[PDB]
Write a protein that binds this ligand. Structure first.
Ligand code: AJ7
Ligand code: ZN
Length: 209
């Protein structure tokens, strides 16, 4: 069902997606342990992900959520990093992408900070790092992240000191860091149909000068 269309670096759509990656890197409280040490990326490719069945599945859930929330989908563009990225772009998000031991409950996690999603590219906690060097901070191996369209609807706000159901009468959770004033939010959804993986971004983290 899925086709990938390469965006040209001269295309304005490529450029705003790259801007969103680059501008949302932050420092992490683990000193780079999970995702590596870097302030920016080398973007190698950005592809648009095109799958009619998945798209309709997404917009069908969206209209329902919309209707339950004063005609507001509360739709965002959020990052998602995962070792299952190739599986997500072909078959969609589902329970198997959920984070069972997640702090905001057992759903699928999305981040405003691209560098937060970068931490999960090689699995929970960075796993053992790139397949080739077992290096969580590998500067060589090509990584991939998804930049996804995510329906939040009524989102339950959970302040954090940083597949389950949504809390009653909510469509997602917002995990909002209250200690790190520079950390952006994470959001959790409990239905795969609430996210469409629009862009596949291939990149490397850059060693700082
Ligand atoms: C916060 C956040 C941001 C983000 O961008 N991406 C994330 C990804 C995950 C995530 C969730 C689950 C898994 C996984 O491996 N599940 C299977 C678990 N077991 C079960 C029994 O046997 C097989 C292994 C891997 C990842 Cl990377 C979590 C949080 C985020
Ligand atoms: Zn490597």
């Amino acid at each position: 069902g899925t086709i990938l269309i390469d965006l040209s670096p001269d295309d304005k759509e490529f450029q705003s997606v790259e801007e969103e990656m680059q501008s949302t890197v932050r420092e992490h409280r683990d000193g780079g342990h999970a995702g590596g040490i870097f302030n920016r990326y080398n973007i190698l490719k950005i592809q648009k992900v095109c799958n009619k069945k998945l798209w309709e599945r997404y917009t069908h859930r969206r209209k329902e959520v919309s209707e339950e929330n004063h005609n507001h989908a509360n739709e965002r563009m959020l990052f998602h990093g995962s070792p299952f990225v190739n599986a997500i772009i072909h078959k969609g998000f589902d329970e198997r992408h959920a984070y069972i031991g997640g702090m905001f409950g057992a759903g699928i996690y999305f981040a405003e900070n691209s560098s937060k999603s970068n931490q999960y590219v090689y699995g929970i906690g960075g796993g053992t790092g790139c397949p080739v060097h077992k290096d969580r901070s590998c500067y060589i191996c090509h990584r991939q992240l998804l930049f996804c369209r995510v329906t939040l609807g009524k989102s339950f706000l959970q302040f954090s000191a940083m597949m389950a159901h949504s809390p009653p009468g909510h469509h997602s959770v917002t995990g909002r860091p209250s200690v790190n004033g520079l950390a952006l939010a994470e959001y959790v959804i409990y239905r795969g149909e609430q996210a469409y993986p629009e862009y596949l971004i291939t990149y490397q983290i850059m060693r700082p000068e």
